[PDB]
């Protein structure tokens, strides 16, 4: 089961030129494409090795789409200012996210298409891909325009068709990088706080995909209450890292085990501090 997503950001300037448009494409937790309107020569560019099979005609075509969407977002930003009666002085943000989820047979599971204005939910295509949920009275104006323009039907055509067919093509071309599960490299470190307590930090490094569970156990019992978890973070090589830390009494370390659940591990892996 896999997903493709496109994330767009448009950021208006207060008479500092037209809005900047940035797009990223993701298959699962791998970025494969990008477009930046502020680049010297704005063009879709590759970000994963498996999209580089695609020839010159693919980058030229997708560049047309982002350039049109940049113009579309610019118009959308002008209208949004009016809906909310905001000054032309302020900088504003329109974000979009759309894409498809497929199963192992490559059949559509779920379609997505939603927008955010200044960090708030604005409008979202419903699960049925025929209707829209508006978050407020400005979004209802958009809803009404789009119901008149039969917009959902065009979005549904892309989500159930094109989206699925592209994701299937990428899953055949990047099969061993996209259906891989890199297991995490795991280790525990020990940092004395004081005379009485020490920190035990459980590391997970170089794993893909990002989804992971680190859990500290004392004599097989969960201590998630006393566990500090960092947010899962990119290593910068398309793999992720995470750590879990628990403050334990000095001399009780051998009673603590770290439990790592990850797709790349056949079953959950159990770690202890190794002095």
């Amino acid at each position: 089961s896999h997903s493709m997503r496109y994330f767009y950001t448009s950021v208006s300037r207060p008479g500092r030129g037209e809005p900047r448009f940035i797009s990223v494409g993701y298959v699962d937790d791998t970025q494969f494409v990008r477009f930046d309107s502020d680049a010297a020569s704005p063009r879709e560019e590759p970000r994963a090795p498996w999209i580089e099979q695609e020839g010159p005609e693919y980058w030229d075509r997708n560049t047309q789409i982002y350039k049109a969407q940049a113009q579309t977002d610019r118009e959308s930003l002008r209208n949004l200012r009016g809906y909310y009666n905001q000054s032309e002085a302020g900088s504003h943000t329109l974000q979009s996210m759309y894409g498809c989820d497929v199963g192992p047979d490559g059949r559509l599971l779920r379609g997505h298409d939603q927008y955010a204005y200044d960090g708030k939910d604005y409008i979202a295509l419903n699960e049925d891909l025929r209707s829209w949920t508006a978050a407020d009275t400005a979004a209802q104006i958009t809803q009404r325009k789009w119901e008149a323009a039969r917009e959902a039907e065009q979005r549904r055509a892309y989500l159930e068709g094109e989206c699925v067919e592209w994701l299937r093509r990428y899953l055949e071309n990047g099969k061993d990088k996209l259906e891989r599960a890199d297991p995490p490299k795991t280790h525990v470190t020990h940092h004395p706080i004081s005379d009485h307590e020490a920190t035990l930090r459980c590391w997970a490094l170089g794993f893909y995909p990002a989804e992971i569970t680190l859990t500290w156990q004392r004599d097989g019992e969960d201590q998630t209450q006393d566990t500090e978890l960092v947010e899962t973070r990119p290593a910068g090589d398309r793999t992720f890292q995470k750590w879990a830390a628990v403050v334990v009494p000095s001399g009780e370390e051998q009673r603590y085990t770290c439990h790592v659940q990850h797709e790349g591990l056949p079953k959950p892996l159990t770690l202890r501090w190794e002095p």
Binding site: Y6, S23, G25, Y58, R61, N62, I65, Y66, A68, Q69, T72, E75, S76, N79, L80, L94, S96, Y98, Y115, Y122, I123, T142, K145, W146, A149, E151, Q154, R155, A157, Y158, E162, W166
Partner: peptide, 10 residues
């Protein structure tokens, strides 16, 4: 590949 059809304005 992203949506070929122009998306309507908000």
């Amino acid at each position: 590949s992203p949506n070929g059809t122009i998306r309507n304005i908000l």
